[PDB]
Assembly symmetry: D2
Homo-oligomer: 198 residues x 4
């Protein structure tokens, strides 16, 4: 049926001071809200293309279908990764996963931070699981749909779009990508991981 | 451990006349061969970055890791999708999947063809399963790692890179994307699908 | 010698209420400031690559050289296009240029607005002169360095990066791309045009 | 008026053995031929959009207008840069330009080669003149329209698209990017340069 904008497991301001409630609202209710509709639209148009056997604009339908389903898919997980009782570090299976995968949790943080802070333009930092080589990796996502292989299982995302922190951190993304760690929903992450390795 | 170039379930010329044996060789032994090594390299470099806690070139490591693991991941499936005893149409569960998903198998072919034939530059045509909205969709992949959402399960791919058909079809990709259907490994596709819906 | 961040021909708040002084500062002193240094860096690195005859990271040097020189080049013109005594419409030669080129000034505005408001991610709207076919065209720039032909002469740019209006307009870029017209430096534009046709 | 496919200043095989006559034909008469029409089309469509004040597909019109005018613009210069009586090295003003700009002609070759040989996917290697910082630089062009700043003056291009050498060199682009130098039209380059500095 249709894609729909999902509910937060918390109150828009749950995250201060690390993330502005202000931001959360706009993000969820505005920006997510949107991808959810483009998503639905593009699908719709393909529906119609095929029904009229006219794929003149195929290039454009695949690009909008890609772009919104993708922002929709990342913003959904972004929410789940966030949490007011989140923070510290991962434990057990995931935590181990991490150190063998990146040496230590700090090693991983580090790279994750670099990943995120150097996107040239819009983008995201993502920890995904490689079913290919059963590895744990970090990709630097450009925009919402580019720069990683098909089949990767997402684990922890961190929105680096300017609308993700400009109201608060302004031009200092560095500060925002730091704050980020203080609300990370490790639980959600650990679940995501278990499932993917299963 | 490392990524490795996989073995074909057939003899390089199994596919004539639809695809030149010549091509298959070059493709497998040359082009795939390569992505498999970049893949391994980029991983390696990240290993080293972190070990030297120097992520100055993070942008470049994530881009090479993305680009080769991605060509590696697509060329692997590309092989499996191909088959000398392949062809005709899908049956059962997948075949049904298809008609409710794109109206008919011809409707789907059509769109799939358009998808593929209009890439602006390098690229691929891909049928992937949406775990999000449990849908069956077609994406137009640019290069090897761009233009589709994270978490999509690949089902049927069709390499549209010039090195995929220039020796044979020259500038007429249209002809090649047609021939394509005659060696499609529906079996492989139907399996891929069952698994993803499971 | 080096690229340098240029001086504004006005006071940071000259532009309210159409553009926040706040924004102008950040933009100029922060974001521009930056591209000007990446610009200088990347150049520097190429200098060094060649001096050590090691172009292992060529991919990355060309990408940073492209990306910063490009943001540097667009933000420079962006400033010049802006003006507190700007506005209304173009006159004379340019104004004529425009109507034969896009039918009317409103026709052109319209398209220019659409151009800008639909970028998928970072980007800009640009009016450039085609020395090829001596035409006047509008391109939709992605990020800072992609989506237009080599040799185009820039005439009027409009920054659509989220950091260009989020503090003020928040998620409503539409509103910002409207306000835009009220400070357009037609004079600067008309000069730019004369020169290019010469 | 319209963009038109230009005439070569030589016979399709003028370039063997360095470039296959076969290739030249296909390239000129097929691939160029095409960009010249997309070019004309996209323009046409914008014409129509505006006439119907319907810019729903603006994203797609700007992308096709960008992509074909760009391949059209690069392939045009590509022809001019090529020459049967070409080769050796540049002289006078340009030659000097080069050594102060990249240290030596070999330093420049080197970087130019690296530039070209590592494109990830489609792309080109380009020497352009920076009116910004009056510099001489090399950019790595992705596809046909991405990866360099607006306002760069093209000087020497080298098509790295697979259809530019696969028939001949197959997967060994390295060999082709070498051969390249043997037909470079320095004259054309030296003129291009004089003009740009003027
Ligand atoms: Fe976002
Ligand atoms: Fe391939
Ligand atoms: Fe900006
Ligand atoms: Fe070409």
């Amino acid at each position: 049926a249709e894609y729909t904008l999902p509910d937060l497991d918390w109150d828009y301001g749950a995250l201060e001071p690390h993330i502005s409630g202000q931001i959360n609202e706009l993000h969820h209710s505005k920006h997510h809200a949107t991808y959810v509709k483009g998503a639905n639209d593009a699908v719709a148009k393909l529906e119609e293309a095929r029904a009229k056997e006219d794929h003149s604009a195929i290039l454009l339908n695949e690009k909008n279908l890609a772009f919104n389903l993708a922002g929709h898919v990342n913003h959904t997980i972004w929410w789940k990764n966030l949490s007011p009782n989140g923070g510290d570090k991962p434990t057990g299976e995931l935590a181990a996963a991490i150190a063998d995968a990146f040496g230590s949790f700090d090693k991983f943080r580090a790279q994750f931070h670099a990943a995120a802070t150097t996107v040239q333009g819009s983008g995201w930092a993502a920890l995904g699981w490689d079913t290919l080589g059963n590895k744990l990796l970090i990709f630097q996502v450009y925009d919402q749909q580019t720069n990683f292989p098909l089949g990767i299982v997402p684990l922890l995302l961190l929105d680096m779009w300017e609308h993700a922190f400009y109201l608060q951190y302004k031009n200092v993304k560095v500060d925002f990508a730091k704050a980020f760690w203080n609300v990370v929903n490790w639980a959600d992450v650990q679940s995501r991981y278990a499932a993917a390795t299963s």
